[PDB]
Amino acid sequence: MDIILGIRVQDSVILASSKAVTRGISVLKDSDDKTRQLSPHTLMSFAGEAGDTVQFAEYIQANIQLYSIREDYELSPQAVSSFVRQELAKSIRSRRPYQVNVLIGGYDKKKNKPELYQIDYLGTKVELPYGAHGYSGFYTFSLLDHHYRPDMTTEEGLDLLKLCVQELEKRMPMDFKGVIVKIVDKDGIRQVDDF
Amino acid sequence: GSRRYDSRTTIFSPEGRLYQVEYALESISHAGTAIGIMASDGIVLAAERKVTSTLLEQDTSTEKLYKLNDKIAVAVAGLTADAEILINTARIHAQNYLKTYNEDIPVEILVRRLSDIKQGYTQHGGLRPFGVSFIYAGYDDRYGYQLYTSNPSGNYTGWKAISVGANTSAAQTLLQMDYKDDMKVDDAIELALKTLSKTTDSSALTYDRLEFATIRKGANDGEVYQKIFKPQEIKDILVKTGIT
Amino acid sequence: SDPSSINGGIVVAMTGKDCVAIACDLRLGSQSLGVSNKFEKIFHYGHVFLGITGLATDVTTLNEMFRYKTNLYKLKEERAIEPETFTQLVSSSLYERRFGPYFVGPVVAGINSKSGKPFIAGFDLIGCIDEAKDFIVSGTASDQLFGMCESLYEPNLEPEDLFETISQALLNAADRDALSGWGAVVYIIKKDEVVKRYLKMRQD
Amino acid sequence: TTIVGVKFNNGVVIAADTRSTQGPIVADKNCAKLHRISPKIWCAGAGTAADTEAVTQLIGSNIELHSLYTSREPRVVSALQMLKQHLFKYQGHIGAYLIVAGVDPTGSHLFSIHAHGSTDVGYYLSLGSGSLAAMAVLESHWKQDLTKEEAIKLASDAIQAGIWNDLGSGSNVDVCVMEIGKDAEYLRNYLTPNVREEKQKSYKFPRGTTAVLKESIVNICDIQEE
Amino acid sequence: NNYDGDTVTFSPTGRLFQVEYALEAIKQGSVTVGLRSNTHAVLVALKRNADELSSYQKKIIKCDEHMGLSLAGLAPDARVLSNYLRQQCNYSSLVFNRKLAVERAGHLLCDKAQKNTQSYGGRPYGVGLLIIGYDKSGAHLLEFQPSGNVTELYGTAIGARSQGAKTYLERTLDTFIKIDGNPDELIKAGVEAISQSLRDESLTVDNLSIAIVGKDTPFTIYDGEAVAKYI
Amino acid sequence: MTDRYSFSLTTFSPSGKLGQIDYALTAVKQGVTSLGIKATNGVVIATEKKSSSPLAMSETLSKVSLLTPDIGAVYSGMGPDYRVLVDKSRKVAHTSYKRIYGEYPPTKLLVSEVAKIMQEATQSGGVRPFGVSLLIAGHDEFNGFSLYQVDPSGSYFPWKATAIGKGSVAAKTFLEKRWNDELELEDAIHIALLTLKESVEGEFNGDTIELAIIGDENPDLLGYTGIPTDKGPRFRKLTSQEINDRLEAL
Amino acid sequence: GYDRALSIFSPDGHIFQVEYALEAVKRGTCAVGVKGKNCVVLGCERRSTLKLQDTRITPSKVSKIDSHVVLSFSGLNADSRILIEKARVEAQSHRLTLEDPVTVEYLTRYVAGVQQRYTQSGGVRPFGVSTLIAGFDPRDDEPKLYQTEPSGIYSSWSAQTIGRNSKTVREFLEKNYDRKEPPATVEECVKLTVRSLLEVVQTGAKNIEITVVKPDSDIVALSSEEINQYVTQIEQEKQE
Amino acid sequence: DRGVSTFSPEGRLFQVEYSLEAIKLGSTAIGIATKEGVVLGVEKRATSPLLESDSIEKIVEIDRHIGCAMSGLTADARSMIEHARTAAVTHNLYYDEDINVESLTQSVCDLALRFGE
Amino acid sequence: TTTLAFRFQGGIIVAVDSRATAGNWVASQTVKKVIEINPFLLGTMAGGAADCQFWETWLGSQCRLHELREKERISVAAASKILSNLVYQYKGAGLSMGTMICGYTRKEGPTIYYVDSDGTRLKGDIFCVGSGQTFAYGVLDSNYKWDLSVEDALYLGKRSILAAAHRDAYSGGSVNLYHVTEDGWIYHGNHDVGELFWKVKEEEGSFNNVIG
Ligand SMILES: [Mg+2]
Ligand SMILES: [Mg+2]
């Protein structure tokens, strides 16, 4: 899959993911949602090898939902990200590794803080104010390094995100058919239906 | 063949009871009494060593109170060797959880895991059950201070105050009488020692016959401290509470 | 492609008079792309300090593995693990993956709590121990570090003098490596006080 | 690396240089290559350094258990047989090349062993990148019925040939002498012909030279009482 | 008594009671007859029904084109053993391009039954088998017991009241062995043999089961109106 | 074949007793007396060499065994059971410790491993408990000198001084009167010899008594020189002559 | 491995280990299930022999298997945890492969299957547990209530009770529950459930637990005071 | 005790004979075959009036052309039905046809004597 | 190969060509590229012929077992996921498959899932797979509406395969048409491309580049 972006502002985490699915010669779909809700206040976007992406994401989703039911409790974003990292670190020395990169955006209800974690297919985890996978960071990070403030509102975050997508649409060779944008905050997860 | 010599450790009686579980509970009723009391500002664990000797090296001795991690401790009643098998498994489970989620294991999840292991030995495998009852004293940031017990059946329950081992009927009645919800650790320390002093089968309660531990947020600021009392420290708290 | 230089980074350790020092850069990258400037590579288990360079997923995995093992050690032994003992544990753990190894360069630093003797050690990715009296280096700028340490180091430096020596060794080595830098941390370790200092350095 | 073994009148001596390398870089300048399998059975390793250490400690561990089981002092042929069968099974993937020497109730012994599991017997042997330089000295000065003093001299001279002529070898000479009816004497840094000269300048900095952003005390102590 | 709890226990007189109890299951089974000449071999079997609404339990099983058997006792055990014979006949044809000798088939059945008489946990087979076949040495008839004992015979019978048929065959020995090149007369002799074991009931059209194998005759089973000719 | 005894042979009786463990302890009670005493600068363990025949060479039968260079063990009960436990204890000291940490285990942890093996023979399928009680003496850097008892159940306890087997009840009373926290190693050996004489019927000399100490490092027993940090084993078995010398000052 | 056949037939055609497992269920605290027109209520008995209990942390008697299905039980507490864990795992597995949450009947059929398996597998004893499984099928407003037992048989019930003195409360339900007109509201259903337990319980204090399950994953447990108000109103109507 | 696969002195397997007694305690099931079809009927036998009787499932489909009715310990039938359904579907997969009723029955009966220790 | 499936007001149209090739050699012109999984579910053949035939028949068996066990028609979501999970297990071993699983149920309505041998499972409105997929997409994209009649939708599917059959060397032979309704699929005949091309050329006025 292609572009996945993330930004952590004052009170929320925003994830932006491209809509295109291309199988070699043709664009088979232009409305694909490259994300799974792991828990009410935790969202994971993904990109990598075909098939393995959705298989890994749904596998993680099933496991977190199982934990939620067993304990009647939502794991913190930090705890979910650690579980995901271990699964990918385990996978990289398997017979056939999951070739999947993820961003985990969650709102910690205990600390009242948004949190964004970036994890690649090797199991390399970092907590960041903003992140990306693939070539997305090469085009967007110089804009984020300039404009980002830790006290930004959600609206200001969306505006900075629009500038990033515009730069991608200008300089990237591939047509990724726009992005689906989702916000994670104290009230849960919602999709911005006009972007 | 071999069937002839099989005791069949995992069968129901006609009344629907598990023979071996019931008999293991009978064994535990002869072990030294262990008591746990939960207060608002901490938990107390107090336990009686079984008829000791003057030549026993007490300061290096441990038969009752064990550390599972920095936040959770257990009091043991029953076969000590059986307990150490389960204790080591619990220590590993706690570390497995910490590695997986990067957070300390919640108290109940550790308790449920050990209790499920006990359950398995009652349903399959044809082996004898563990002759052990545990009192779990622990803290996590979800439920705070917690007390649990588990027995050879693999059943577990939560408690404000509880006893296991010998004379639990007498001990539980004494605890039920003097326990109050707004109680503090220093008061709970006194209640635990007073209850052991009355229920003991020994002539008098002295420092060399006791193991003592507290779990306090009496650790400088937003954290929890475990204190396994030394022989001299058990001697001092016995004088302070006016038992010796 | 080479797993030991995908993410970049460096660690250095030195001995002084009744003290030891261990330091690292803060960069994590995906080859040319800088990803994080807060990726610390030094960890501690009690009074024993461990720096790890190499593939970042393995750095994190090994920290979690040694936290796991030193926690069980402490529960069973009823005492904190010592630098000499921990060194053997790292070596054993690495060699057990002889034909599918962790792509790392670990470094141990600490003072023995009973003898008071300063201790440092280094390892290759499969467990071979380098126990030097003077200094240990690791990472994508290890050549540069060897050059700095060999000329700057002298024995029996006082804690505050050792800080200057190891800091200058790290900084100038990192500035000659594309995949190292983006911040730095220095630990000064004495028998019962440890000071941690973040250094100001160029951010390219 | 240069390593040699030399038989003499009443025993055997083994010697090694003290340089370990990573490619062209010297990782450690005073490495210890003489390893103990048992009190009076010692060996020196070339090749993959972790493999030489690991295979020594594994067989050394099993040799100790065997000694306790049989109530007998360990034999060099046992160490040899256990080493070769372990190495053969791994088909050269464990890169251990060793010279094994020692004394036991049967007498004094000297063997070499290669990574694929083949072994050899001899009165004088050399291994490592400096083995050709060492063997040149051994082939020039070795004779039958050497004394202890003559064997130590020959062994250290052979290591020196490696030190000065092989780039893979350097620094100091370590020696271990194993004589029949005596304690094995390990002579660490028996020769020290490569001390660095004093530098032209002191590079001690003035205090306050390095720029600092933040200072903080690190809590190495456990959670405190009260 | 104290020695019949399992197959792994000898009695003080050296008997194996579990095996003897398995032998008893055969005696409760319905009668079946086997006999042969030098050209053909015949099986005749009296099938047993549960009641008047039920079918008559099949007794004869084909193992190959040149071999098959009839059963008396536990029918599922006959299915297990006949399946094994089918596999062994098949292995011989596939690997060696060779029709399995009837004598070798008997040896294989013996060894399979033996393993269930010397080990803990298992039980003996509860069925007896009469195996007929035509191979490179002519016509053959075998009797199998779940003790492991296999015997080659001119004629025999097993099941309830089998002693009457066995005595008849012992009298007729010199006559029926000479019935060469006449399948109908050999079957007649078998139908007359099994008649010496009937009481109260007689041979009807859904009661009788006949099988034959010979020189130029594949193993074929006759049931229904195909046996009315012999009633 | 196959081991078809996959069920426990030790089970709880209605009264809560584990019969097979109690019976194992009875076998220990019938065994020859062995003892241990801890001093300020050492530990001593001792037992009688009850020779089954005078034609037997009792020096070839070792009742006191080295487990590690700083840890030794003695027993009361079934000799063969002890011998295999010594084999297992020596191996586990390497496999579960020395091959991991590069050093020998502390006394308390080796005791813990031996205890686990004995516990498992009390619960695992198709086996009986070990018919021995062990006394394990040792030294390690951070815990100093120590002495432990291990029973058939797998339970273990630390002692200042104790005795097991035949005349243990009388011997423990004798030790209670003599033991103090200021004893030197030579004083503890003297008390050990005095205590052991009471439970011995026949000959009492260096050839019929087996005695070993955990004391100072013995560089003369190391087998090599050159490494300053290696100073030799603390376990030392006393000779027949060394025992007899201390029997004159008795 | 341990292979011993513990569950076997007796001469009269009974499997005693399965029947003795039912005797363990008879000993367990009473559980009751009642379905209204638009809800299902699960009531549970708490024996007051144990005070000084910490009710915050003590295992509760009703367990969520998924967001829309709950499970209560009578019998061995430790045994029930194994069935609850298996049911929870299967619920997530069903969502993963079918892309739809389990129906109440499917979840019941699975748990019942596990129980049956433990009655003819070597080396294992039957579960000493009977269960009440209640909830609503996805996108359905028809109430569902099922029962399982150690043998593995299961069935649907308009109302049912299990555990000690369940013969008495079933007697009450059989004369008080009308099929043509089930409890039309949550209030009426909870009232009938508390009434049924009051036939057996003792003090209406901390001895009665009540959990209400409504359509679309709406599950809530009533508190002490809320239940206490039902207990109060029932006896004040009884004084007449 | 005694083996689960033990023969009686009469030549019958104890456990098989005892299971036949359990079946005698089961609810009645009847079948009648005609040239126009086969009919299957069962007694439901609910233990209480509060038990919703349409949840009692003692008649079960194996395939479109094969049905089945049960009597005895009905929980034991579930794995037998599962096997029958799998065997019917598997044969259709392997042979592109309906399986014979006798062959299906034989496959179910192969499970019967697979018990022991 | 050219296969397509699209959702519309009246259900689903499935259209496929009939040609199989081994290199340049035309092995068959009469290949059945629609697999009749059951009377309600259809699958399309592209990639490996055996892999598609074998595993989609197998899928039919799993669907039949599901409805026997659950007493309810399997959803298209569940049916497609059984196949995608199966092929994911074999990932790396060399299965070749690109298929559209098509069905029409009460809870879902008309539904199409693209399932693929590297594990991909995509729900969508229009899918086209094969060597001639790009040609068929062109005709589909420019003429597709949700409110197409059954008659016009059938023709659109027929016309799109014809476009591919004309231009793609490895597509041709004949066109097979299917219409999937809630009550099951309906077969709408085999249409020889040779005869169809001339008929469409005359009636439509298209393919002026070709002399007829
Ligand atoms: Mg740099
Ligand atoms: Mg730069």
From Swiss-Prot, chain B:
Q: Which PROSITE patterns match?
A: PROTEASOME_ALPHA_1, PROTEASOME_ALPHA_2
**Cellular component, GO annotation:** cytosol; nucleus; proteasome complex; proteasome core complex, alpha-subunit complex; proteasome storage granule
GO BP: any one term: proteasomal ubiquitin-independent protein catabolic process
Instruction: Name its cellular compartments.
Output: Cytoplasm; Nucleus
**Which key words are in the record?**
Cytoplasm, Isopeptide bond, Nucleus, Proteasome, Ubl conjugation
Stored SMART domains: Proteasome_A_N
**Listed Pfam families:** Proteasome (PF00227), Proteasome_A_N (PF10584)
Report where the covalent cross-link Glycyl lysine isopeptide (Lys-Gly) (interchain with G-Cter in ubiquitin) sits: K99, K198, K230
Q: Which CDD domains match?
A: proteasome_alpha_type_4
**Which InterPro entries does its entry note?**
Ntn_hydrolases_N (IPR029055), Proteasome_alpha (IPR050115), Proteasome_alpha-type (IPR023332), Proteasome_asu_N (IPR000426), Proteasome_bsu_CS (IPR016050), Proteasome_sua/b (IPR001353)
Q: Which domain of life is it from?
A: Eukaryota
Q: Which family does the record assign? A: Belongs to the peptidase T1A family.
Please give the subunit comment from the record.
The 26S proteasome consists of a 20S proteasome core and two 19S regulatory subunits. The 20S proteasome core is composed of 28 subunits that are arranged in four stacked rings, resulting in a barrel-shaped structure. The two end rings are each formed by seven alpha subunits, and the two central rings are each formed by seven beta subunits. The catalytic chamber with the active sites is on the inside of the barrel.
Question: What's in the misc comment field?
Answer: Present with 17100 molecules/cell in log phase SD medium.
Please give the name of this protein.
Answer: Proteasome subunit alpha type-3
Its source organism is: Saccharomyces cerevisiae (strain ATCC 204508 / S288c)
> Gene encoding this polypeptide?
PRE9
Swiss-Prot record, chain E:
Query: Where is it found, in Gene Ontology cellular component terms?
Result: nucleus; proteasome complex; proteasome core complex, alpha-subunit complex; proteasome storage granule
Q: Which Pfam families match?
A: Proteasome, Proteasome_A_N
Organism superkingdom: Eukaryota
Q: What residues bear Phosphoserine in this entry?
A: S11
- Spell out the InterPro entries in the cross-references: Ntn_hydrolases_N (IPR029055), Proteasome_alpha (IPR050115), Proteasome_alpha-type (IPR023332), Proteasome_asu_N (IPR000426), Proteasome_sua/b (IPR001353)
UniProt keywords (A-Z) are:
Cytoplasm, Isopeptide bond, Nucleus, Phosphoprotein, Proteasome, Ubl conjugation
Glycyl lysine isopeptide (Lys-Gly) (interchain with G-Cter in ubiquitin) cross-link located where? Answer: K188
Cell compartment(s), UniProt = Cytoplasm; Nucleus
Indicate whether Mitochondrion appears among the record's keywords: no
The UniProt function text for this chain reads: The proteasome degrades poly-ubiquitinated proteins in the cytoplasm and in the nucleus. It is essential for the regulated turnover of proteins and for the removal of misfolded proteins. The proteasome is a multicatalytic proteinase complex that is characterized by its ability to cleave peptides with Arg, Phe, Tyr, Leu, and Glu adjacent to the leaving group at neutral or slightly basic pH. It has an ATP-dependent proteolytic activity.
For this chain, the family text in UniProt reads: Belongs to the peptidase T1A family.
Q: State the PANTHER family in the record.
A: PROTEASOME SUBUNIT ALPHA/BETA (PTHR11599)
The protein's name in its UniProt record: Proteasome subunit alpha type-6
Name its species: Saccharomyces cerevisiae (strain ATCC 204508 / S288c)
Instruction: Point out the gene that encodes the protein.
Output: PRE5
UniProtKB/Swiss-Prot annotation, chain F:
Reply yes or no: does the keyword Ligase apply.
Answer: no
The record ties this protein, via Gene3D superfamilies, to: Glutamine Phosphoribosylpyrophosphate, subunit 1, domain 1 (3.60.20.10)
Q: Where is this cross-link: Glycyl lysine isopeptide (Lys-Gly) (interchain with G-Cter in ubiquitin)?
A: K108
- Keyword Ubl conjugation on entry: yes
Biological process (GO) annotations? proteasomal ubiquitin-independent protein catabolic process; proteasome-mediated ubiquitin-dependent protein catabolic process
> Could you tell me the keywords of this UniProt record?
Cytoplasm, Isopeptide bond, Nucleus, Proteasome, Ubl conjugation
Q: List the disulfide bonds.
A: none
Highest taxon of source: Eukaryota
Gene Ontology CC terms, in alphabetical order: nucleus; proteasome complex; proteasome core complex, alpha-subunit complex; proteasome storage granule
Q: Name one Pfam family in it.
A: Proteasome
Q: Where in the cell is it found?
A: Cytoplasm; Nucleus
Q: Which InterPro entries does this one have?
A: Ntn_hydrolases_N, Proteasome_alpha, Proteasome_alpha-type, Proteasome_asu_N, Proteasome_sua/b
Explain the purpose of this protein: The proteasome degrades poly-ubiquitinated proteins in the cytoplasm and in the nucleus. It is essential for the regulated turnover of proteins and for the removal of misfolded proteins. The proteasome is a multicatalytic proteinase complex that is characterized by its ability to cleave peptides with Arg, Phe, Tyr, Leu, and Glu adjacent to the leaving group at neutral or slightly basic pH. It has an ATP-dependent proteolytic activity.
| Similarity comment text for this entry | Belongs to the peptidase T1A family.
Q: What else is known?
A: Present with 7060 molecules/cell in log phase SD medium.
Please give the name of this protein: Proteasome subunit alpha type-2
Swiss-Prot record, chain I:
Residues the entry annotates as binding bortezomib? A49
Instruction: Kindly list the GO CC terms recorded for this protein.
Output: cytosol; nucleus; peroxisome; proteasome complex; proteasome core complex, beta-subunit complex
EC number(s) per entry: 3.4.25.1
Enzymatic class: hydrolase
Q: For this chain's UniProt record, which GO biological process terms are given?
A: proteasomal ubiquitin-independent protein catabolic process; proteasome core complex assembly; proteasome-mediated ubiquitin-dependent protein catabolic process
User: Known catalysed reaction(s)?
Assistant: Cleavage of peptide bonds with very broad specificity
Q: Report the subcellular localization.
A: Cytoplasm; Nucleus
Please list the GO terms describing molecular function.
endopeptidase activity; threonine-type endopeptidase activity
Instruction: Tell me which UniProt keywords the record has, alphabetically.
Output: Cytoplasm, Hydrolase, Nucleus, Protease, Proteasome, Threonine protease, Zymogen
| Signal peptide positions on this chain | none
**Active site residues per record:** T1
> Could you give the subunit structure recorded for this chain?
The 26S proteasome consists of a 20S proteasome core and two 19S regulatory subunits. The 20S proteasome core is composed of 28 subunits that are arranged in four stacked rings, resulting in a barrel-shaped structure. The two end rings are each formed by seven alpha subunits, and the two central rings are each formed by seven beta subunits. The catalytic chamber with the active sites is on the inside of the barrel.
Mention any additional remark: The side chain of Thr-1 acts as a nucleophile, and the N-terminal amino group acts as a proton acceptor. Present with 8530 molecules/cell in log phase SD medium.
Homology family: Belongs to the peptidase T1B family.
Instruction: Name it.
Output: Proteasome subunit beta type-5
Q: Which organism is it from?
A: Saccharomyces cerevisiae (strain ATCC 204508 / S288c)
